[PDB]
From a paper:
ITC revealed high-affinity TAR binding based on a KD of 4.2 ± 0.3 nm. Despite only three arginines, we hypothesized that this variant would possess strong affinity comparable with TBP6.7 or TBP6.9 because each threonine has the ability to form hydrogen bonds that stabilize the β2-β3 loop backbone. Each protein makes a hydrogen bond between Oγ1 of Thr-50 and Nε of Arg-52, stabilizing a favorable arginine rotamer for guanine recognition (Figs. 2B and 3 (E and F) and Fig. S3B). A main take-home message for TBP6.6 is that stabilization of the β2-β3 loop by threonine-mediated intramolecular hydrogen bonding is favorable. TBP6.6's ΔΔG° of −0.2 kcal mol−1 is slightly more favorable compared with TBP6.7, and its ΔG° is equivalent to TBP6.9. These observations provide a rationale for the preference of threonine at positions 48 and 50 and how glutamine and arginine are tolerated at position 48, whereas arginine is not well-tolerated at position 50.
The viral trans-activator of transcription (Tat) protein uses an archetypal arginine-rich motif (ARM) to recruit the host positive transcription elongation factor b (pTEFb) complex onto the viral trans-activation response (TAR) RNA, leading to activation of HIV transcription. Using yeast display and multiple rounds of selection, a new class of TAR-binding proteins (TBPs) was identified that bind TAR with nanomolar affinity. Although it was hypothesized originally that each TBP variant would recognize TAR using fundamentally different modes of binding, we demonstrated here that each TBP binds TAR using a conserved subset of arginine-to-guanine interactions within a lab-evolved β2-β3 loop.
Residue numbers in the entry: 2 to 94
Write the structure that this text describes.
Amino acid sequence: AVPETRPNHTIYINNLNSKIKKDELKKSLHAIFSRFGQILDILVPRTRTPRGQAFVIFKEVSSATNALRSMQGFPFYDKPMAIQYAKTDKRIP
RNA sequence: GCAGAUCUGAGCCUGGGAGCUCUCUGC
């Protein structure tokens, strides 16, 4: 899937390491992405099979923008993160 | 209904994974 996106509060990360427990994955994504700004939630959706996908919802769009740029392709648990803006913002105002 | 659960529950769809349904648990 290669959808048209535009900046919003939420980034979509895939190519994550599927061997990492979901609770540890959430804590590690929080620790590394909180440098860019306040995080409202981190979602790791349950899929029929493990697929290495997560969403990080930032309080400010600028935080998402800087995280997307800075962390694109960066190793996380020995795999390069692939990052996009979310197709549809997951923030709940 | 809401929230969770599978490399540690399942059937599909897909066949270059942001898909669907079920089952189970709590409320």
